[PDB]
Design a protein around this ligand. Structure first.
Ligand code: FES
Ligand code: FES
Ligand code: FES
Lengths: 343, 343, 343
């Protein structure tokens, strides 16, 4: 019951952010949960976490607990982390699964491809089938050295969602296959997922709050320049890849929305060294205690302020004709794509 | 707006649990709160707690704070624990009331039968009546050595709800009158009340999670066998009585539902000894640290899992034709009775 | 969809409190939030906090974060505490602002009259105006030595809301201009704002819970007598001023409702001495540890009790014909005024 014009933010030069209801309303969220996050490829991890047989990880997004597991046969698969019998969760955290997944409730065992191996007493229950009593899968794809899932089984590949992205990311960082997760920050954030994307898409505050060109592509954008290149990739719907100068490491921001005003964030820092140099250990500390706190306070305060009847519905996107670094035109592009799911 | 067929689970051999909405929906809960828990006899305590004049207890169920009190005249009564003047609560916890109940707000005093004794300045207020300014009662019955309340004042007795139960319980345990509460575990549990009953009604997991026959009766069931007999009584709507081998003590599980995904549980352990033997003190510790944690984790994980779009609506009730101990047919009987309130 | 007769409580001699829904319902609250608190003068502070240039305070009411600030030019102003750019909050707590208000996000600066002074890069954004990019004001008035705001910009003055109040308050306390805030108690209270007003409007319990005449006026009442006079002012919608015997100090109760069952309360204690006498420091301790706890427990227990189906809808307002100190007739007057917004 809450819609937007199609030309919304099509012209970045004269554009305003969403009406406030799109940042706060439970009905806008449930629509986006089904129309966007249930039908789009969602990035969940770098490939290093899932590189070896029996390696698995677990993730929560839009209230779906997901397990991604590298099979004994080295095939990467993803399932809903819920037992098909009576609904117990199957696995927790991350690590190396064993050769079978045993449900902690009634001890049904599944192969690592989801196949029900043994369900106790099953051959004496009437009208039971081993198949169709399997763990329920969803699509998974390795792309650009990262791992994407999709809850729509008719989905086509990541490349159809992010045309050109993988080729450009490999041109930004040539050692992505060699990266290892050196630190992760988990934060449940009281801000709508679109508020967090807004913050990322702009460099109006890189100096008053923390050689610059922001170019839009098909469902992704890139913030590029020289500082020694630096890259900042935003990709639909909300995963950000940073390649700081030197191009030898990455940080990735994963957004796992929970509800209209809550978002789970993973802030991952990837280096190529197993043992960190002191420069890297110090850099992790600067990210945890300085940089990321400043960013989270910003979106939290903004989430509070925009509910106020004193915030007049929308806010002005500060685009300049020359598209300088402090131009907010990236926001306009993102909100235009979002408007397309609200016609 | 969420209904069920009448033959739902009438045939245990080919049966599935409820659609997931009945375990999660606030509208299913409010309907069950009024149609089931406001019109059924609810077990709240063993008779020992209320055996002496002025003994009282307090209980919370479906958001109703109840007081049960043995009158000075030795008559057992139950009232809503709310002052009829402006709504302050009257009593807290349990113990021995005094000869009058004095409201902590404006100090109206009531006899232990709810009769307003003194309301300050009342004879100068126009159109006031002492009677019809009393504490508001509800039905209470002592049955099977336990205490049952009912919020429907037109209710008939417990026996019409649980035909045969008291006779069978006395055949399971002959010293019920002599039992004393040796320990109580209070836990607010993030699981729908029907999930907790499901867990109790099955012995599919007594070995992989913690001479067996489960027979259904009129609104109650019994899990029976030899291990020296052992008994497990489920009674409508959700109170469970355990009589472990030796038949000399009992544990009782009381379920006081709060909302669609929350249930208050009392786990009571009753012995006949005032001073416990070391075997009993150790047994209380095994129940608190081992047994009950395992049970609560099970239902909590199940409550989370069944919301997942990966849990395909319902789950298969694993009944075998021979009705062995690991047969889940008890669940089918319970869900059939519940379906009867959702036509 | 929840209304009241107009003669509701017009006759204090035969009157009952509201039906329970008006104390609990989110729909009754949202209506009162817009019809009452968005259109009425709301008291927020004593004038001493805002007496000097650049002095400011912040307040939360009905989910609106407000800033009141004495301009460099000594003019008192109030604004919504939200940046007009993208919605960050501007200021926090209380104290002395600087000559400009700099938004912590993108560093737009505002004059202390809300005027946008500098918005970085603004002259290169198309169709931008400095004016109409200002902080959004609301009405503020100094009245009776206290500070009132109003969110309706077409409002007339406080005097039209509280006719006679300021003249009577100055007759109760002659040194209001000289008062200094000696202590504040902040408590988020789980009780509807109308429950807290009910508690204040009565002296049925001044003796069983903690020369007396309660006279009603236009939107305010006064509890008066000798104990050496004492005064107790209630004013619409919910601010209470106490002038204890000796008339040399005041306590003020501010009610900032949050939702149907939550109210933020400030309990302010004002003396004329900058350095407190031991009698005053002890009196602050008696208020914090004894008096106010008793009052907050009362309304919290009442909020719980009135939801119970055992509380029969309404409660009797105990008015006597002679209108003695323990007469509850003040409540009737307040609820009659409230009924006028629920026709
Ligand atoms: S819930 Fe997993 S085996 Fe029963
Ligand atoms: S609320 Fe119990 S006497 Fe007034
Ligand atoms: S939000 Fe205040 S300057 Fe951008």
């Amino acid at each position: 019951v809450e819609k937007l014009p199609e030309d919304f933010c099509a012209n970045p030069d004269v554009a305003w952010t969403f009406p406030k209801v799109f940042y706060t309303s439970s009905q806008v969220f449930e629509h986006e949960k089904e129309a966007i996050f249930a039908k789009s490829w969602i990035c969940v991890a770098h490939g290093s976490e899932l590189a070896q047989p029996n390696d698995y990880i677990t993730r929560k997004v839009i209230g779906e607990n997901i397990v991604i597991i590298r099979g004994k046969d080295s095939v990467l698969r993803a399932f809903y982390n819920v037992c098909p019998h009576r609904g117990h969760e199957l696995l927790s955290g991350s690590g190396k699964a064993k050769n079978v997944i045993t449900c902690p409730y009634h001890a049904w065992t599944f192969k690592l491809d989801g196949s029900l191996a043994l369900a106790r007493n099953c051959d004496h229950v009437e009208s039971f089938d081993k198949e169709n009593s399997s763990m329920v899968p969803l699509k998974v794809e390795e792309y650009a050295g990262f791992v994407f899932i999709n809850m729509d089984e008719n989905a086509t590949c990541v490349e159809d969602q992010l045309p050109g992205f993988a080729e450009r990311l490999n041109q930004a960082c040539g050692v992505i296959k060699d990266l290892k997760l050196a630190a992760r920050f988990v934060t449940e954030t009281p801000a709508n997922w679109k508020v967090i994307v807004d913050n990322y898409m702009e460099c109006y505050h890189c100096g008053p709050a923390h050689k610059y060109w922001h170019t839009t592509h098909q469902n992704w954008t890139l913030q590029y320049g020289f500082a020694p290149e630096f890259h900042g990739f935003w990709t639909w719907p909300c995963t950000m890849f940073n390649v700081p100068p030197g191009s030898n490491f990455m940080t990735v921001i994963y957004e796992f929305p929970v509800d209209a005003e809550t978002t789970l964030q993973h802030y991952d820092i990837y280096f190529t060294n197993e043992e960190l140099t002191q420069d890297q250990k110090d850099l992790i500390e600067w990210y945890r205690n300085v940089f990321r706190p400043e960013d989270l306070n910003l979106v939290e305060s903004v989430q509070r302020g925009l509910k106020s009847r004193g915030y007049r519905g929308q806010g002005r996107i500060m685009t300049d004709k020359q598209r300088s670094g402090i131009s907010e035109h990236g926001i306009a592009y993102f909100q235009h794509l979002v408007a397309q799911y609200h016609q």
